[PDB]
Amino acid sequence: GRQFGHLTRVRHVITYSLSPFEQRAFPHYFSKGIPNVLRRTRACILRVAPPFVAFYLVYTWGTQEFEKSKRKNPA
Template identity: 60%
Template sequence: MGKHFGNLTKIRHVVTYSISPFEQRAFPNFFSKGIPNVWRRMTTSFFKVAPPMILMYTTYTWGNNVHEQGKKKNVDDFENDE
């Protein structure tokens, strides 16, 4: 009843290879190459990412403190009220 989805057309001069999922290794060289590569990438990008994040965090905390102080009432304004 027609062709299946993966075989709708035939492309000439294109060769594809595949390996069975049962023959693949899930984590090849994970500990010997993967973790050092992650460490190298983190250390090289740290000085590009950390300063803006620190600046944004300090700005955020400063803004929250100013907002909280703005919500408080000044006690000296109400000391003569009865």
């Protein structure tokens, strides 16, 4: 159905690309990758974490409460 050639109209855009045998596959895999990963993690942690922290708290409280309930009481 959809094929290359008339998917959309584009004008005045130039693209430069380099052959895969003229360049490295791992340019800066440790010097620059790790700061980017830290940036992404810092961005996402505040959105993703608090629900799972709350689940952890509920899990601990429920397990402790069940264990306390099972044990017998004096009198």
